[PDB]
Symmetry: C2
Subunit: 405 residues, 2 copies
């Protein structure tokens, strides 16, 4: 049960009255969290596997070590005694989180949630049995034999992925797609959406769930590429998105923002998966939500025990959107140290847009190095503008040549 | 003249390709400059007279020393070799700034501007003789005789101080006695115009104008500000006109806080600060993300472009939503400040607060702000004030005090 209570007070970072958050993972998402915390005078300690990670250039202090190493994490936690331990990624020692929580440290949203979302089978079963929400047809496969049976039964085209992926359209892709796989039925959906439901305290000290507008997005090879708010869906589906998300978060519990992933086709909605922490597609809220209220600020506030203003409408407590916006990733196509970006004269002259460069010290093929942010009364204009700003930018490394996209 | 040029590229903080700014003064204003710089992967070095000042907490590195000491500043500059030296306050060694500039370092907007704005009468002369913009009528006096002749021509009532007293009639002349005699202006509202000089897509310097910012000063200290100010379209255009003239003379790159008085359609230039101004914190909510006065200054001084919208010969900067701010002032002294009343304060819709992180308080110290937005500026003003006053302050060695 939530380790903390409604908070009415805050002290000052670097002094003895300070509240402190511990970020386990210091990528671009942890960075925005550290920024909101700094804007609130909250002490920030960032942790990750390499030095000068984005969040730690902004943090008061940082620690560098293997985050799958329980001893490392414990040394840090015992040294810092933070008000909140905030996982930014999945690759963190799960036992350590349970131990911190069991010892009285607030693990966001709770240890169990990170554990559940780690195992795809556990998650899907939790979604079906406990949350009782609709999902695409599916079945598991332990061996190539069970795989043939699964793909043949689900019917073609067919989605395949490991529990921790391939797209089979015919019996000939079955072998090429092959352990434990999840075979899913293909749904010709209108759009993929992330519902950024946040569990936080109301003035009575009870936990409520408020919902931001659904976030639309598309992924290039299982990697978020662009997102926008609000997703162009019908009101009926929108209410169904909030309903499914509520069931999911009600089961997960704790405090924090969730990235509930769903598929929308007309008025129909299927639940796919969920991450118990801020999600990359949610970066659009850096522009679509008003200041101090992006998914990062919402997450921070929620886990410190602070309130979040809402707006009740037909049984659901909603979080009002300020202006439609969209983002587009700036991915590296090269490796090397000291990245640099060009094409800013044209990229930064585009109205109602801007970019954010994460500060990652090094690049590898595919590493997200920043995003283009755009806003407009017409979400479709914003989307196109974000893509255009991102595409006007070229990246280079110390030991490589300029490349685009 | 401006020493850098249009910028098309940026490296990465903490690596050898990094661009780097040096903040001379690390209070709340430098803090937001530091935040936008971090969001652009720009390396930040924060400097001030005390440790863990707001901007240092956010910066990559910091230096602490007496900023009136030229040797100290030179040591930092020589060590860091920043792309931009951004003065946050006025109390900085001026010779030092001139020396940096002469040695090839880019002092924002330029050293001369900081020197002029610091010298009250030299600024007043610039405004009149060079900027050629309207200001309050004034004149000087060396002898009681001339004081009488001055007050007489200036009209009553009038203000008088030396290089003060308020004479309402020719009976206080002696009581009032180099002196300056400044007329009085019963203005409707005080406004700050945040003109920004930066490069355009063609590599040429333009000046773009955000909507005028309204505010009211309480004993020299600003208390509340808002955007847009409630003035006529004719006064608004005059504001842009006056600002353009003032900034054309100051030159350089960066944002300016041009202070003016508005009465109906009449506008008077009063003062100018060649750097982000505290009344401008309202842009943290009224302007779009990455475009508050702090990001505008940053982009400008790095030589990066800034989107604008031409309207009647003026390159304007569009506002996102009306907003307002209200200060959170300390009424006590001491270390390790803390704030309560957050359950109610942060439950108010369309508002939030920024707490600066200052490790210590003194009576009158600005410790944070309440921010509020709304389609109706009056509602925003009202809300910020309300949120600010719901907050109470305490120090390690003091009792709780309200606003």
């Amino acid at each position: 049960v939530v380790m903390i209570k409604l908070r009415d007070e805050l002290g000052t970072a670097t002094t003895d009255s300070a509240q402190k958050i511990l970020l386990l993972g210091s990528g671009e998402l942890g960075k925005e969290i550290a920024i909101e915390a700094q804007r609130l005078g909250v002490e920030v300690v960032a942790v990750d596997r390499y030095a000068n990670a984005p969040a730690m250039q902004v943090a008061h202090r940082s620690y560098v070590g293997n985050m799958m190493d329980k001893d490392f994490l414990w040394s840090v936690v015992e040294r810092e005694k933070p008000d909140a331990i905030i996982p930014e990624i999945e690759a963190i020692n799960l036992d350590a989180l349970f131990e911190f929580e069991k010892d009285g440290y607030f693990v966001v949203p709770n240890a169990r949630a990170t554990w559940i979302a780690m195992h795809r089978e556990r998650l899907r079963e939790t979604l079906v049995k406990e949350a009782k929400v609709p999902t695409s047809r599916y079945m598991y496969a332990t061996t190539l034999d069970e795989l043939y049976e699964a793909c043949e039964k689900i019917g073609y085209p067919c989605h395949t992925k490991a529990i921790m992926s391939y797209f089979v359209k015919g019996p000939e892709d079955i072998p090429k797609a092959w352990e434990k796989i999840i075979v899913e039925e293909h749904i010709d959906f209108d759009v993929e959406v992330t519902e950024l439901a946040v569990r936080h305290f109301d003035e009575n000290g009870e936990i409520v769930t408020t919902f931001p507008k659904p976030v639309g997005h598309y992924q290039i090879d299982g990697d978020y590429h662009a997102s926008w708010q609000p997703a162009e869906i019908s009101e009926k589906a929108e209410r169904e998105v909030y309903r499914i998300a509520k069931r999911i978060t009600d089961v997960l519990g704790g405090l924090g923002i969730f990235g509930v992933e769903m598929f929308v086709k007309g008025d129909k909605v299927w639940a796919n998966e969920v991450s118990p922490r801020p999600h990359d597609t949610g970066m659009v809220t850096l522009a679509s939500h008003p200041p101090g209220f992006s998914e990062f600020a919402l997450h921070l506030r929620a886990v410190l025990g602070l309130p979040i203003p809402g707006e009740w409408v037909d049984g659901y407590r909603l979080f009002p959107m300020l202006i439609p916006a969209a983002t587009h990733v700036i991915k590296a196509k090269v490796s090397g140290y000291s990245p640099r970006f060009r094409g800013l004269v044209k990229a930064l002259s585009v109205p109602n847009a801007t970019v954010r460069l994460f500060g990652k010290p090094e690049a590898y093929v595919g590493r997200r190095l920043g995003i283009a942010l755009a806003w407009d009364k017409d979400v479709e204009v914003a989307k196109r503008k974000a893509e255009m700003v991102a595409h006007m930018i070229e990246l280079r490394t110390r030991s490589s040549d300029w490349h685009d996209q």
